[PDB]
Amino acid sequence: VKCDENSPYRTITGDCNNRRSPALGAANRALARWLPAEYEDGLALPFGWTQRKTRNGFRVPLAREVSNKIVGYLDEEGVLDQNRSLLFMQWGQIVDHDLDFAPETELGSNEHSKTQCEEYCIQGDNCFPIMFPKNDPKLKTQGKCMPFFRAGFVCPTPPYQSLAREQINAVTSFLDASLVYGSEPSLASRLRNLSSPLGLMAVNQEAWDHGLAYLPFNNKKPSPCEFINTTARVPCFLAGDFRASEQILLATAHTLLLREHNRLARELKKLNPHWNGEKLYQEARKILGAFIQIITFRDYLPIVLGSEMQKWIPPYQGYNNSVDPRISNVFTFAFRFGHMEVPSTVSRLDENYQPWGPEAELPLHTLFFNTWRIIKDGGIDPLTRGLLAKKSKLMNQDKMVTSELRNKLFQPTHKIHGFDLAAINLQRCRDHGMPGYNSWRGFCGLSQPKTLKGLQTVLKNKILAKKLMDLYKTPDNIDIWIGGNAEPMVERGRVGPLLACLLGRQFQQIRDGDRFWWENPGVFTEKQRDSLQKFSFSRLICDNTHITKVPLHAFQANNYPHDFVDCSTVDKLDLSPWASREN
Ligand SMILES: *[C@@H]1O[C@H](CO)[C@@H](O[C@@H]2O[C@H](CO)[C@@H](O[C@@H]3O[C@H](CO)[C@@H](O[C@H]4O[C@H](CO)[C@@H](O)[C@H](O)[C@@H]4O)[C@H](O)[C@@H]3O)[C@H](O)[C@H]2NC(C)=O)[C@H](O)[C@H]1NC(C)=O
Ligand code: HEM
Ligand SMILES: *[C@@H]1O[C@H](CO)[C@@H](O[C@@H]2O[C@H](CO)[C@@H](O[C@H]3O[C@H](CO)[C@@H](O)[C@H](O)[C@@H]3O)[C@H](O)[C@H]2NC(C)=O)[C@H](O)[C@H]1NC(C)=O
Ligand SMILES: *[C@@H]1O[C@H](CO)[C@@H](O[C@@H]2O[C@H](CO)[C@@H](O)[C@H](O)[C@H]2NC(C)=O)[C@H](O)[C@H]1NC(C)=O
Ligand SMILES: *[C@@H]1O[C@H](CO)[C@@H](O[C@@H]2O[C@H](CO)[C@@H](O)[C@H](O)[C@H]2NC(C)=O)[C@H](O)[C@H]1NC(C)=O
Ligand SMILES: [Ca+2]
8 A cells, every 4th residue: 555665674565676667566456468368259258168179189087087187196115205304394384384375266155156066066157176087986985076166366366358367376475474464454453462562473371382372273163173073163263474374394383483573573582672562563574574485495395306406596686676575476376286185193292202092093074174282181291292203195196185185175165075185286277277287388488298109208107108198198287287397307406307497486486576685685683694594493493392312404304303402402593693682
């Protein structure tokens, strides 16, 4: 609404980052388009919508079928990443939720369409069902489809007619910890503790974790968290991002970062007793945002992109106001490579890092929107230790997405643990008008295979290639998500050539087009920056939990106790440079 022009703090909505073009990178604006949208009717209808209309002369294969033939597997053995901890997967979902969010279309609350899609699977308006192919076990037990609703679009929401359909991004594009503080002014206020001039975030008043805080409970019912265990009746958490409680390990990480804020706020009040509530809030919020960018750019990306890091994200050279900081519509699918790094089980470890109880290891599908396991079954220390001592799932061309997500995904709106995140992603690329695989290979200056043989050389897998061509008939029709994720991985990274390019650009753009990047001269002081350079996730753990043994590099596979050192050996964030002298 109004730019404070000389304020040292970002705005909640993301606006005013860029001075010439203020709304650039703000929340609730359209996702940027690196390539023109590709729709069946060229304006808004997705491919596969009208059964009869081909795409490049062929019918596009059912989402769920690509899922059955290509994406699934049975044997969970040998599937773990020998050199990436569970935190690797987990930090990616956080960076993701900070950068993008395409909410489904609403116009539903006392609607018979939410039921007309569920119940009868009739395609129409925003109901874009995922039909089950013949010979699918879910036909026998669930029905004929999986409800799916088209994502929201800008200008409107009601029917509409004008330009090409452009999806919304309900979050700020800048990597600014928006998932902790919120992207809307009204949500950001609700989240704060405006009862005490201490600038703290609100916490739970109904439950505590060893004197430590828990995220507040969401006031609104019906709550999906209460549904998964009608007896424990524990609601979902209230955070800066709506998906916070999507799965137990994500809500855990959310709790660690809320704790970090309040922790910084009370450490600041001590140094600068004179500062007011707004000042405390903003200054702590500014440090946390710097934390996300450091962990992400220093420790996280280098091991995702690998040898391709320098090629796409060169050394920083200053803020460049000509760079488009917005998240592209394709990034929101490229970053979903993370779905293939999610393992089937989640563990809880005790203080010696040994199983925690009878039921220490649990199926991933039992943890969706599961808040009672945290509150009523041990706190978050057992879960955090799991994130360090356990490994992520390694993407494997023969074993892409675990059945826990592939067949038992729980959707907050519906009542069953029977959705398919793989089919949903594929159905979502189409919903978003994504160009085919070769269109992106070309955008990244990569060869564009046209024959079966060609696809074998790119994928370096004869069988996978063969299945892809039987379903798609032409590499030009292959959906980006499954296309980019089937490529072999680059040296020392976790995604192939296409995915590296798409990720690389985005991250280099949101870092170079951010007026408030931490390394941006004038945003912090040389001394403040000297301090921040020491932030580490290991330390975040030491200061916000009761764990005392942690690894120096929490993202790699670490074995206990050999790789775990005592919290004393881990560098601290010296907040002294934030002391402000009067006269
Ligand atoms: C801030 O970010 C900006 C946005 O990306 C950057 O702007 C780029 O600025 C360059 C020029 O510095 C733009 O063009 C480049 O310059 C050459 C033309 O003068 C191009 O080379 C050749 O062009 C044709 C080939 O296409 C040849 O036939 C010809 O002989 C000439 O040699 C370069 O290849 C290059 O395009 C460029 O378009 C801008 N980037 C874009 C796409 O927006 C800028 O670098 C940044 N500013 C600073 C100072 O940091
Ligand atoms: C459950 C889910 C996860 C783990 C238990 C999980 C994990 C990740 C990781 C680890 C990612 C990156 C490293 C990542 C990226 C993005 N996802 Fe996924 N995710 C779970 C569940 C979902 C669901 C449900 C969606 C919505 C799918 C849809 O199309 O409707 C989802 C999405 C995305 C997403 C896009 C965001 C947007 O713009 O709205 C990523 C960038 N995830 N996830
Ligand atoms: C729904 O959530 C319930 C908790 O909110 C959960 O019940 C809990 O179940 C465990 C074991 O199943 C019990 O734990 C232990 O309790 C005593 C020790 O206090 C032991 O003697 C028992 O052997 C048991 O191991 C909890 O006491 C119990 N909580 C209560 C009060 O009911 C259910 O298991 C959850 N059900 C579903 C469907 O998820
Ligand atoms: C496990 O992963 C880590 C990180 O990917 C590897 O260690 C890094 O190796 C590079 C060499 O290119 C060093 O420059 C870094 O210093 C290492 N990271 C740190 C902080 O030590 C490690 O080699 C991997 N183990 C195996 C067997 O590949
Ligand atoms: C807002 O912050 C104040 C801290 O000043 C919280 O009040 C304290 O709450 C703790 C834990 O319930 C008690 O030990 C103290 O007695 C309270 N101190 C004072 C001076 O009030 C308050 O709970 C916070 N509110 C929310 C919603 O988080
Ligand atoms: Ca953000």
